[PDB]
Amino acid sequence: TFSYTLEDHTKQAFGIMNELRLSQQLCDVTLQVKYQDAPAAQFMAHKAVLASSSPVFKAMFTNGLREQGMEVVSIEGIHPKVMERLIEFAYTASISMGEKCVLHVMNGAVMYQIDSVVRACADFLVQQL
Amino acid sequence: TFSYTLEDHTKQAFGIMNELRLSQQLCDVTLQVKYQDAPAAQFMAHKAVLASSSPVFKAMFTNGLREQGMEVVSIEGIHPKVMERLIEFAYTASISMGEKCVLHVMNGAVMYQIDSVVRACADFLVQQL
Numbered sequence: 001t002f003s004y005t006l007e008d009h010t011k012q013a014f015g016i017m018n019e020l021r022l023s024q025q026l027c028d029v030t031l032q033v034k035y036q037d038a039p040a041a042q043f044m045a046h047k048a049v050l051a052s053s054s055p056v057f058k059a060m061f062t063n064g065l066r067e068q069g070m071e072v073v074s075i076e077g078i079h080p081k082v083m084e085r086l087i088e089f090a091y092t093a094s095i096s097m098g099e100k101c102v103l104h105v106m107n108g109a110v111m112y113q114i115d116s117v118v119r120a121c122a123d124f125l126v127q128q129l
Numbered sequence: 130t131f132s133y134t135l136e137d138h139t140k141q142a143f144g145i146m147n148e149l150r151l152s153q154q155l156c157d158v159t160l161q162v163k164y165q166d167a168p169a170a171q172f173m174a175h176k177a178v179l180a181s182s183s184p185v186f187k188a189m190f191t192n193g194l195r196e197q198g199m200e201v202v203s204i205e206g207i208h209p210k211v212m213e214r215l216i217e218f219a220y221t222a223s224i225s226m227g228e229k230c231v232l233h234v235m236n237g238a239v240m241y242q243i244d245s246v247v248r249a250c251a252d253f254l255v256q257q258l
Contacts, residue, residue: 001225001226001227001228002225002226002227002228002230002231002253003223003224003225003226004223004224004225004246004249004250005222005223005224006218006222006223006245006249007222009182009218009222009245010139010140010142010143010222011139012181013139013143013178013181013182013219014139014142014181016180016181016187017177017178017180017181020177020180020181020187020191025191026176026177026180026190026191028157046175046177047155048146048149048155048175048177048178049142049146049177051145051146051149051155052141052142052143052145052146052149053138053142058145058149061155062149062154062155066198066199067198068197068198069195069196069197069198070195089135089138090142093134093135093136093138093139094132094133094134094135095132095133095134096130096131096132096133097130097131097132098130098131099130099131101131102131116135116138117133120133120135121133124131
């Protein structure tokens with residue numbers, strides 16, 4: 001038989017998936033993030049990508065109904081910049097923040113069960129000791 | 130600043146995306162493949178994943194309308210087993226076929242501009258010489 005594997009494929013395909021998000025193409029969920037007194041922000045994304053990086057989004061989005069088009073989801077208790085950085089991680093495999101943001105990002109990462117980011121933010125805080 | 134990258138992330142997230150396809154969860158496109166006298170087959174998938182692996186699916190799916198839910202797409206001129214193997218490549222980064230399928234798969238890969246698979250099927254046929 002003939003078998004082939006492209007190792008770079010998942011990297012490349014996520015790169016295009018990130019482009020479609022930035023271009024707001026094929027998106028099926030809009031996250032409206034309102035936190036205390038910070039201004040409300042909005043993030044469009046693909047439920048499949050969010051589901052692939054966060055067990056909490058997967059269950060949030062996998063329900064028996066066939067949702068028709070564009071679902072709005074109200075998100076409480078996480079800052080816009082934290083949500084943004086988590087979304088970016090889901091689409092890029094990387095995340096970046098200043099040394100004083102690390103704590104709020106772990107909170108958000110714990111809240112959405114992004115085990116890779118939790119473990120990393122935990123490593124950082126412990127090393128500052 | 131603090132920066133983190135998970136190299137395995139895109140692999141892992143595609144693994145979950147493949148699970149959601151096999152479970153027919155969060156799918157927004159059904160490909161109905163009818164070819165000559167072969168029996169008709171159906172494949173559910175996520176437009177975002179197809180778009181990320183095939184320029185032809187991306188343009189096929191990126192149009193000005195906000196499609197509502199589940200689009201059916203009729204696919205002609207490619208065999209069910211070829212379409213299946215291309216879909217599998219989009220979701221897994223790998224593709225497998227017997228030495229006599231390699232020609233029909235390149236046809237399909239050329240038709241959907243999956244440049245990685247075209248280049249590989251071309252390499253194989255030339256080496257059989």
